[PDB]
Every structure is written in structure tokens, then in C-alpha cells.
Design an enzyme around this catalytic site. Sequence first.
Site, PDB file in Angstrom:
ATOM      1  CG  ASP A 178      41.463  39.752  28.923  1.00 25.79           C
ATOM      2  OD1 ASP A 178      41.966  40.742  28.334  1.00 25.79           O
ATOM      3  OD2 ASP A 178      42.097  39.041  29.741  1.00 25.79           O
ATOM      4  CG  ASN A 233      40.712  43.095  40.858  1.00 30.29           C
ATOM      5  OD1 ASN A 233      41.840  43.363  40.465  1.00 30.29           O
ATOM      6  ND2 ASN A 233      40.449  42.837  42.124  1.00 30.29           N
ATOM      7  CG  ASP A 250      45.600  41.771  44.832  1.00 23.55           C
ATOM      8  OD1 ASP A 250      44.546  42.233  45.305  1.00 23.55           O
ATOM      9  OD2 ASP A 250      45.719  41.586  43.607  1.00 23.55           O
ATOM     10  CD  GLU A 277      31.729  37.570  41.274  1.00 24.45           C
ATOM     11  OE1 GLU A 277      32.167  38.164  42.282  1.00 24.45           O
ATOM     12  OE2 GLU A 277      32.409  36.700  40.691  1.00 24.45           O
ATOM     13  CG  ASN A 309      40.261  41.056  45.903  1.00 28.38           C
ATOM     14  OD1 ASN A 309      39.966  41.802  44.972  1.00 28.38           O
ATOM     15  ND2 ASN A 309      39.498  40.045  46.268  1.00 28.38           N
ATOM     16  CG  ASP A 345      36.864  42.073  43.526  1.00 25.29           C
ATOM     17  OD1 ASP A 345      37.785  42.334  42.743  1.00 25.29           O
ATOM     18  OD2 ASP A 345      36.821  40.974  44.106  1.00 25.29           O
ATOM     19  CB  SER A 397      43.068  44.826  43.668  1.00 25.13           C
ATOM     20  OG  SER A 397      42.757  43.470  43.898  1.00 25.13           O
TER      21      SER A 397
END
Length: 129
Positions: free
Chosen positions: A101, A59, A48, A35, A46, A52, A50
Site C-alpha cells: 500500500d 483493521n 474509532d 500484534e 479501537n 483489529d 473499528s
Amino acid sequence: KVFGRCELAAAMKRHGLDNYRGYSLGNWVCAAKFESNFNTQATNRNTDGSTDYGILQINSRWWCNDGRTPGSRNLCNIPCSALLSSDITASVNCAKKIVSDGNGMNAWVAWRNRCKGTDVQAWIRGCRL
């Protein structure tokens, strides 16, 4: 800070990640390697809008507040910058909420694509844990 493989393994173990929710230590070290290449300061934008952040590339759309992701939830209740610290505590605490989650470690694309089903124990081979 750019961690060494065993140095990160030890820090993650100390923070309670070895076997958290059933994921052995090797899984977390493998996820961090792919990562962020073990760099706490890594950031990636990203499509969209957002971003990381950090060692585990958490995120901004759901987990942290960066002040520039319109309509995002701040589920870990922390500024995203806290995730870039040389101290991994914040990243670790937030990762624990993420992995609980529902989708487990599949929440991390690099884990799913490069760690899942591989011999993850190799990532901690040779370390004094």
C-alpha cells in the site's frame, strides 16, 4: 490457534512471505508476536469503533468487513472473521495487499515500535526452514 514461533515461521514462508516487498521472514514473525502473541483469534477494539483481527491484527476500517464499522472499505474483500481462522492464508493474502500500500510494514504499529531496526533474524533462529 496459538502458533509456536518456528511453526508460524514455516507457515509464513510456505505462503510466500519471506522477503515479500523486501521484508525478511524475521520481520513478519516479530510483527505477529507483538500484534497478537501468535494467536489467530485475537481481536482488539479501537477508539474509532473499528476492530483489529487475527494474527496480524488487520483493521476493519479499510481491510475487511465486520458489519459494524460505519463507512469502511473492504479492500481485501473478506469478512473479518475469516482472519481469525487457524489457517493463516486469508491473513497472509490480505497482509500482502497492506504491505504493498505504500507505507510498507509501518502500517503495523507494533512492528514500527518494537521490530523496526532490531535484529529481526533472532525471531527465526533455531528453526528448520
